[PDB]
């Protein structure tokens with residue numbers, strides 16, 4: 226309501242399944258939400274921040290976040306937002322990564338709060354042991370191939386080609402949505418824009434199987450200059466302080482372009498509406514000063530690296 | 537070689553991937569083949585005979601038949617030859633059906649032979665335990681959505697609607713082919729016409745997985761009147777002498793359409809060209825003796841039920 230509006234003011238809402246319905250749920254109850262992360266590398270990078278930070282905004286508003294590490298789905302591969310078929314990673318490799326990603330995630334959430342402690346989950350737990358028979362009958366039966374073919378992630382690759390492995394991926398994330406709803410009271414799933422189709426599939430699964438849940442997507446981070454975000458010439462800014470140092474990390478933020486800066490304060494910091502506007506005024510009135518950028522860099526660096534790393 | 541030539545002669549060959557290549561293995565080796573049967577009911581019916589009597593003709597030629605009972609594919613359902621989506625049977629049921637279907641295959645094959653005893657298998661054994669992830673990584677990666685989409689069982693239902701469940705069936709029958717190939721030297725798979733799609737998917741798996749194997753299908757059983765083969769007023773003709781009695785059974789056969797009779801002698805009996813021809817002359821030459829239909833009925837009744845039963849059916853009839 227006020228959280229949804231704020232998110233909205235912050236430009237963190239791309240699409241929602243039912244705005245009026247979610248907003249009433251948010252204002253009424255303590256909502257249990259989830260967002261999943263597939264280990265595709267040994268580190269999360271700045272492109273995952275928006276989604277994590279948003280999970281934390283919800284925790285600050287009193288909701289209960291569940292970050293999910295795709296220990297199983299990571300072995301399959303999401304065609305979502307990918308232009309070509311991907312090579313399969315080794316279980317041993319995906320396993321190692323999971324562990325690393327599980328650690329990063331945990332820096333952003335509160336596992337001790339009362340009322341809404343966070344949780345970190347790995348879908349390997351419930352998919353790892355799923356046999357083919359049960360999957361096909363219990364999940365598979367509820368989806369038509371048509372339904373499936375019309376999803377962007379598949380519709381996008383039909384000229385290129387897609388494997389049955391990657392085409393099936395959405396049933397898996399559909400299943401995670403259903404499990405978490407069943408065991409955890411989860412009624413909201415968040416994700417990046419390309420996740421829309423996987424999100425609406427999970428929802429269709431609960432609906433055909435039960436009879437009460439929502440989806441919301443976060444817009445991709447944009448560069449006013451029309452460039453690509455997190456794209457340096459030292460490559461990727463990782464949240465792994467040994468791949469990308471605090472220095473390096475902090476320097477990245479400080480060099481944020483004036484045209485981008487405020488948008489970035491809104492997406493990435495926990496500053497108030499009122500605080501951000503000040504900064505806006507100061508950029509107008511005294512940009513040589515570069516106050517907005519300096520705040521951004523300290524705020525983000527603290528969040529990702531801690532106060533010590535800030536020093 | 538000769539077995540092909542005679543299958544061909546009996547009109548039992550509808551399609552084969554590589555005749556030339558197959559005729560060569562048959563003539564050159566003792567081929568291990570398989571045919572699958574899904575328990576969609578407690579008993580097999582006469583729609584099942586052509587494939588079962590063919591397995592038997594192979595075994596007679598000296599190859600080794602493997603009949604697989606669809607312990608696990610029976611729980612998924614094959615869209616092939618079905619114009620709509622089926623209801624999922626329940627495990628306990630399907631399993632009840634498999635035990636029963638396992639006993640009927642057993643009478644058409646020789647487990648005793650020298651060189652090629654028949655074997656009966658149940659795919660629940662390798663699929664019951666398969667996990668989603670191995671399934672999807674190890675099998676799935678090999679198949680494009682395009683390849684699956686061009687199948688007739690799918691193309692045919694894109695209108696009426698097909699679940700991902702029935703969509704995926706072909707991966708399981710393709711996996712059976714591979715499994716048998718690896719563990720039993722199975723190089724040939726047969727089935728009725730509608731299995732053509734499922735048979736070729738099996739060979740793609742193997743080819744994409746190994747780098748050797750064949751498929752053959754038998755034509756669908758027809759009636760010169762264009763009505764449905766094996767459909768009574770009573771329903772279906774079962775192979776279970778407790779669903780359909782020997783008498784009921786026998787009667788079904790003596791009653792074949794004159795037009796249908798020689799064709800059926802070819803598909804359903806172990807008589808010779810020579811003999812078949814005879815009965816054919818008899819029928820042009822004296823069709824009221826109903827010569828043909830009698831042999832047929834006697835022949836199929838003995839195969840399915842034994843002479844004691846034939847004795848009896850001949851009696852109360």
Ligand SMILES: N[C@@H](Cc1ccc(O)cc1)C(=O)O
Nearest residue numbers: 261262263295298303398401
């Ligand atoms: N598929 C998503 C992550 C994800 C994994 C599992 C889930 O249940 C939900 C989301 C991605 O590729 O980023």
Ligand SMILES: N[C@@H](Cc1ccc(O)cc1)C(=O)O
Nearest residue numbers: 572573574606609614709712
């Ligand atoms: N699908 C076949 C039976 C079958 C099952 C498993 C196989 O591996 C092969 C064939 C049918 O419906 O008759």
